[PDB]
Symmetry: C2
Subunit: 273 residues, 2 copies
């Protein structure tokens, strides 16, 4: 019995490429049109059945906290002005059946450290990890696609997608063997290979379903999550799944700009002049 009801969001991104805008908010609070990156990822997790949100914070923690915690003053004012559609929007930022908690990472030691910071909230349960910088627009929530594989095959699951071989130095790359048309069993993982030397072109994106056994492997190990997963491979089953969906890499100014263009068009009718 796999049940995945907890998700971890590292939201301490320095976003140096986005300074000065990230002086007073973490990178994951920058909006795409009218919505912070992190809220797209939370909405995906909630659509996939997550009920427990775990935010790993750094500096400017209160931009995250004040975004997801209730703000009675705003709700009371909007009610008075009879702006009920707006009130509903504000209240859906954190739906009623969902809870959130906040944990401070001790220092910016990488994703693996951020994930390990969450162990006191996760316990001995499988959990999701979502990197809000990977904004994914999909007909079916990508985390749901990963969770259903995790439950069916009883193992951890990495979201992956094919990338051009020329780009593999940007990514963690999985060496894997097929088990069905979209799912593969991971045997090795390599961080930022030279393109000529990449074992495959199947890259890890910022969506994970991980068994709690990963925590012990990150305590032995900036601590890289890939190190934990590589160590986990020796004890437990790890799968990679080619999700259906369009990923916007908002870690760069250009990628974030194209997300604004594309999603502004699709969900807001905004068109460049």
């Amino acid at each position: 019995h796999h049940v995945v009801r907890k998700a971890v969001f590292p939201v301490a991104g320095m976003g140096t490429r986005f300074l000065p805008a990230t002086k007073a908010m973490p990178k994951e609070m920058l909006p795409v049109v009218d919505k912070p990156l992190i809220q797209y990822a939370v909405e995906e997790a909630v659509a996939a059945g997550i009920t427990d949100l775990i935010f790993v914070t750094g500096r400017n923690k209160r931009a995250i906290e004040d975004h997801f915690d209730a703000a009675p003053e705003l709700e009371t004012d909007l009610e008075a002005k009879g702006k009920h559609e707006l009130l509903a929007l504000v209240r859906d930022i954190l739906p009623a059946h969902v809870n959130c908690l906040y944990i401070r990472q001790s220092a910016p030691l990488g994703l693996g450290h951020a994930v390990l910071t969450a162990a006191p909230a996760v316990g001995n349960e499988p959990f999701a990890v979502l990197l809000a910088d990977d904004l994914i627009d999909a007909d079916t929530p990508v985390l749901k696609q990963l969770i259903d594989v995790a439950v069916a095959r009883q193992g951890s699951v990495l979201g992956v997608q094919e990338v051009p071989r020329e780009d593999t130095r940007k990514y963690g790359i999985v060496a894997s063997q097929p088990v069905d048309a979209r799912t593969e069993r991971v045997t090795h993982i390599v961080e930022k290979p030279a393109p000529e030397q990449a074992p495959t072109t199947l890259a890890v994106v910022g969506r994970y379903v991980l068994e709690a056994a990963i925590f012990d492997h990150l305590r032995a190990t900036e601590i890289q999550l890939t190190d934990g997963i590589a160590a986990l491979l020796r004890e437990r089953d790890v799968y990679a799944h080619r999700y259906d969906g369009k990923r916007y890499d908002c870690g760069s100014k250009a990628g974030m700009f194209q997300a604004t263009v594309a999603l502004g068009r699709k969900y807001h009718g905004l068109i460049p002049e």
Copy 2:
């Protein structure tokens, strides 16, 4: 006339931009990598302003933490030897510039926000800048207005022509020319019907006002700045100046989107696919 103080109303609810403005005011949303308010502050400083006055509302934190020094970030950036970034962070509030923060008591409009600043301004002429009006100009627009204010010894409103169909969006000045760019204001009307608009000359969010305006905003019953200016016209000279520069009205999602596209292209080389 010496104009060294500028007032920035930064309590914008930005209901049109919820949920992104849940935890930050509208003026903290970025255009590419820079909050709207920082563009306006940089213009004010380039125009010789040394005293910044921020009128805050809820989420005052986002503004304060953006402009107040962040020692932790500077020390970390120093360690990383990212010296161009460190200088960038330090330039958010230059060394010759100071800022103070005042809370508006309630969201009673621009006229109330301006009156809120009176204890910091005293009896001297001062600038007002609305960061939602993002202006890209070869010479700072506030400087263009200040030089007219000093030369003609009066208050100055920044103005531009708008389509007659749009006059319902704006305060509209009825004025007579004094030269090719400067006009003597005789009447002002808020949001006229297009068929009844006296002109198509609209006020933009850049003002240089004599301190005599404060007394006229204390009589006003949402207190509208337009009402204060209209009342000021009976006692003092008020001019309007056709500034050189391109204004982006970021008060709508569409307007803000086109600012991102346009400034993304010009200053960052970003092109929509």
